[PDB]
């Protein structure tokens, strides 16, 4: 409704204020950040072990002279 | 892909093993078959990433785009020979085989046949 779009406005306002700022997450404090870190570790194992932000190097192979 | 038949070979191979490698070939045959079936299976090349979706919608695009450039520039070599003057010791072994046996044996057979004439009787 339109008296219920009066509430919808309210939320839209808070979203921008946060996004162009942050306090933790604006409304979240350390608590968010801490939770992430618990999920973030387990995902490394699911996703590999390193190179997550940096291109993988490679190596090349050899033989036996016969 | 990598191999082929030359002559008559995977069957015609295994049975026949020049004494100077003879023993080796028995073991080598079975190794080869392992390589054969394996190679045929593998993928040959993957896809090559849809950048459009990832660049737009992974909006850390400073990171993504830099890694992109490094990947797109990224050059690749080939594997390594090691064992292919065997290929050429082949033409040598092929001399040994024909002329070195061909010739001496042809002269031998020459005598066996000339002696065949009289022993018709």
CSV table of C-alpha atoms in Angstrom, one decimal:
chain,number,residue,atom,x,y,z
A,1,UNK,CA,0.0,0.0,0.0
A,2,UNK,CA,1.0,3.7,0.3
A,3,UNK,CA,0.8,4.2,3.8
A,4,UNK,CA,3.0,1.0,3.5
A,5,UNK,CA,5.4,2.5,1.0
A,6,UNK,CA,6.0,5.0,3.8
A,7,UNK,CA,7.9,2.2,5.6
A,8,UNK,CA,9.6,1.1,2.3
A,9,UNK,CA,11.1,4.5,1.9
A,10,UNK,CA,12.7,4.2,5.3
A,11,UNK,CA,14.7,1.2,4.5
A,12,UNK,CA,16.0,2.5,1.1
A,13,UNK,CA,17.5,5.5,3.0
A,14,UNK,CA,19.5,3.4,5.5
A,15,UNK,CA,20.9,1.2,2.7
A,16,UNK,CA,22.7,4.1,0.9
A,17,UNK,CA,23.9,5.7,4.2
A,18,UNK,CA,25.6,2.5,5.1
A,19,UNK,CA,27.0,1.8,1.6
A,20,UNK,CA,28.7,5.2,1.4
A,21,UNK,CA,30.0,4.7,4.9
A,22,UNK,CA,30.3,1.5,7.2
A,23,UNK,CA,30.8,1.0,11.0
A,24,UNK,CA,31.6,-2.6,11.0
A,25,UNK,CA,28.7,-3.2,8.9
A,26,UNK,CA,26.5,-0.2,9.9
A,27,UNK,CA,24.3,-2.1,12.1
A,28,UNK,CA,26.3,-5.3,12.7
A,29,UNK,CA,29.5,-4.5,14.6
A,30,UNK,CA,32.4,-7.0,14.9
A,31,UNK,CA,29.8,-9.8,15.0
A,32,UNK,CA,29.3,-9.9,11.3
A,33,UNK,CA,33.1,-9.9,10.7
A,34,UNK,CA,33.7,-12.7,13.2
A,35,UNK,CA,31.1,-14.9,11.6
A,36,UNK,CA,32.5,-14.5,8.1
A,37,UNK,CA,36.0,-15.6,9.4
A,38,UNK,CA,34.5,-18.9,10.6
A,39,UNK,CA,32.9,-19.5,7.2
A,40,UNK,CA,35.9,-18.1,5.3
A,41,UNK,CA,38.4,-20.7,6.6
A,42,UNK,CA,36.3,-23.7,5.5
A,43,UNK,CA,35.7,-22.3,2.1
A,44,UNK,CA,39.5,-22.2,1.4
A,45,UNK,CA,39.5,-26.0,1.7
A,46,UNK,CA,36.5,-26.2,-0.7
A,47,UNK,CA,38.3,-23.9,-3.1
A,48,UNK,CA,41.9,-25.0,-2.8
A,49,UNK,CA,44.6,-23.7,-0.4
A,50,UNK,CA,46.2,-20.6,-2.0
A,51,UNK,CA,46.6,-18.3,-5.0
A,52,UNK,CA,43.0,-17.0,-4.3
A,53,UNK,CA,44.0,-13.5,-5.2
A,54,UNK,CA,47.1,-14.2,-7.2
A,55,UNK,CA,47.6,-16.0,-10.5
A,56,UNK,CA,48.9,-19.7,-10.1
A,57,UNK,CA,52.5,-20.3,-11.3
A,58,UNK,CA,53.2,-23.7,-13.0
A,59,UNK,CA,56.2,-26.0,-13.4
A,60,UNK,CA,57.4,-28.3,-16.2
A,61,UNK,CA,58.6,-31.8,-16.6
A,62,UNK,CA,61.6,-34.0,-17.4
A,63,UNK,CA,62.9,-37.1,-18.7
A,64,UNK,CA,65.6,-39.9,-18.8
A,65,UNK,CA,68.3,-39.9,-21.5
A,66,UNK,CA,68.3,-43.4,-22.9
B,1,UNK,CA,46.1,-38.5,-30.8
B,2,UNK,CA,49.8,-39.0,-30.0
B,3,UNK,CA,50.4,-42.5,-31.4
B,4,UNK,CA,49.3,-44.5,-34.4
B,5,UNK,CA,49.8,-47.9,-36.1
B,6,UNK,CA,52.9,-48.0,-38.3
B,7,UNK,CA,53.1,-51.5,-39.8
B,8,UNK,CA,50.9,-54.1,-38.1
B,9,UNK,CA,51.6,-53.4,-34.5
B,10,UNK,CA,49.9,-53.8,-31.2
B,11,UNK,CA,49.2,-57.4,-31.5
B,12,UNK,CA,52.1,-58.0,-34.0
B,13,UNK,CA,54.3,-56.3,-31.4
B,14,UNK,CA,54.0,-58.0,-28.3
B,15,UNK,CA,54.9,-61.5,-29.5
B,16,UNK,CA,58.2,-60.5,-30.9
B,17,UNK,CA,61.0,-59.0,-29.0
B,18,UNK,CA,64.6,-58.8,-30.5
B,19,UNK,CA,66.8,-60.6,-27.8
B,20,UNK,CA,68.9,-57.5,-27.2
B,21,UNK,CA,65.7,-55.8,-25.9
B,22,UNK,CA,63.5,-59.0,-25.8
B,23,UNK,CA,62.7,-59.2,-22.2
B,24,UNK,CA,62.0,-55.4,-22.0
B,25,UNK,CA,59.4,-55.4,-24.7
B,26,UNK,CA,57.0,-57.8,-22.7
B,27,UNK,CA,56.9,-55.4,-19.9
B,28,UNK,CA,56.8,-52.4,-22.3
B,29,UNK,CA,53.7,-53.6,-24.2
B,30,UNK,CA,51.5,-53.6,-21.1
B,31,UNK,CA,52.8,-50.1,-20.1
B,32,UNK,CA,51.9,-48.8,-23.5
B,33,UNK,CA,48.3,-50.0,-23.3
B,34,UNK,CA,47.9,-48.2,-20.0
B,35,UNK,CA,49.1,-44.9,-21.7
B,36,UNK,CA,46.9,-45.6,-24.7
B,37,UNK,CA,43.5,-46.0,-23.0
B,38,UNK,CA,44.4,-43.1,-20.5
B,39,UNK,CA,45.2,-40.6,-23.2
B,40,UNK,CA,42.2,-41.4,-25.3
B,41,UNK,CA,40.0,-40.6,-22.3
B,42,UNK,CA,41.3,-37.3,-21.0
B,43,UNK,CA,39.8,-34.0,-22.0
B,44,UNK,CA,41.8,-32.3,-24.7
B,45,UNK,CA,41.1,-28.7,-23.6
B,46,UNK,CA,38.6,-27.1,-21.2
B,47,UNK,CA,36.3,-24.2,-21.9
B,48,UNK,CA,37.8,-20.7,-21.8
B,49,UNK,CA,35.7,-18.7,-19.2
B,50,UNK,CA,32.9,-16.3,-19.9
B,51,UNK,CA,34.6,-13.0,-18.8
B,52,UNK,CA,31.5,-10.9,-19.4
B,53,UNK,CA,29.5,-12.4,-16.5
B,54,UNK,CA,32.4,-12.6,-14.2
B,55,UNK,CA,33.9,-9.1,-14.8
B,56,UNK,CA,30.6,-7.3,-14.5
B,57,UNK,CA,29.2,-9.3,-11.6
B,58,UNK,CA,32.3,-9.9,-9.6
B,59,UNK,CA,32.6,-6.3,-8.8
B,60,UNK,CA,36.1,-6.4,-7.2
B,61,UNK,CA,37.0,-5.9,-10.8
B,62,UNK,CA,40.3,-4.2,-10.0
B,63,UNK,CA,41.5,-7.6,-8.7
B,64,UNK,CA,39.6,-9.7,-11.3
B,65,UNK,CA,40.7,-7.5,-14.3
B,66,UNK,CA,44.4,-7.5,-13.3
B,67,UNK,CA,44.3,-11.3,-12.9
B,68,UNK,CA,42.5,-11.4,-16.2
B,69,UNK,CA,45.2,-9.6,-18.0
B,70,UNK,CA,47.9,-11.9,-16.5
B,71,UNK,CA,45.8,-15.0,-17.5
B,72,UNK,CA,45.2,-13.7,-21.1
B,73,UNK,CA,48.9,-12.9,-21.5
B,74,UNK,CA,49.9,-16.2,-20.0
B,75,UNK,CA,52.0,-18.3,-22.4
B,76,UNK,CA,52.5,-22.0,-22.4
B,77,UNK,CA,55.2,-24.4,-23.5
B,78,UNK,CA,55.1,-28.1,-24.6
B,79,UNK,CA,56.4,-31.2,-22.9
B,80,UNK,CA,59.8,-32.8,-23.5
B,81,UNK,CA,61.5,-35.4,-25.7
B,82,UNK,CA,63.8,-37.9,-24.0
B,83,UNK,CA,63.6,-41.1,-25.7
B,84,UNK,CA,63.3,-40.8,-29.5
B,85,UNK,CA,66.7,-41.5,-30.7
B,86,UNK,CA,65.2,-45.0,-30.2
B,87,UNK,CA,63.1,-43.8,-33.1
B,88,UNK,CA,66.4,-43.4,-35.0
B,89,UNK,CA,68.4,-46.4,-33.5
B,90,UNK,CA,65.4,-47.9,-35.3
B,91,UNK,CA,66.7,-47.2,-38.8
B,92,UNK,CA,70.0,-48.7,-37.4
B,93,UNK,CA,68.2,-51.8,-36.0
B,94,UNK,CA,66.4,-51.9,-39.4
B,95,UNK,CA,69.7,-52.3,-41.2
B,96,UNK,CA,70.5,-55.2,-38.7
B,97,UNK,CA,67.4,-56.7,-39.3
B,98,UNK,CA,67.4,-56.7,-43.1
B,99,UNK,CA,70.9,-56.5,-44.7
B,100,UNK,CA,72.7,-57.9,-41.6
B,101,UNK,CA,70.3,-60.9,-41.7
B,102,UNK,CA,68.7,-60.4,-45.2
B,103,UNK,CA,72.0,-60.7,-47.0
B,104,UNK,CA,73.9,-63.4,-45.1
B,105,UNK,CA,70.7,-65.5,-45.0
B,106,UNK,CA,70.0,-65.0,-48.7
B,107,UNK,CA,73.5,-66.4,-49.5
B,108,UNK,CA,72.8,-69.3,-47.1
B,109,UNK,CA,69.4,-70.1,-48.8
B,110,UNK,CA,71.3,-69.8,-52.1
B,111,UNK,CA,73.2,-73.0,-51.2
B,112,UNK,CA,70.2,-74.9,-49.7
B,113,UNK,CA,68.3,-74.4,-53.0
B,114,UNK,CA,71.1,-75.4,-55.4
B,115,UNK,CA,71.5,-78.5,-53.3
B,116,UNK,CA,67.7,-79.1,-53.8
B,117,UNK,CA,68.4,-79.9,-57.5
B,118,UNK,CA,70.3,-83.2,-57.0
B,119,UNK,CA,68.2,-84.4,-54.1
B,120,UNK,CA,65.2,-84.5,-56.2
B,121,UNK,CA,67.0,-87.9,-56.9
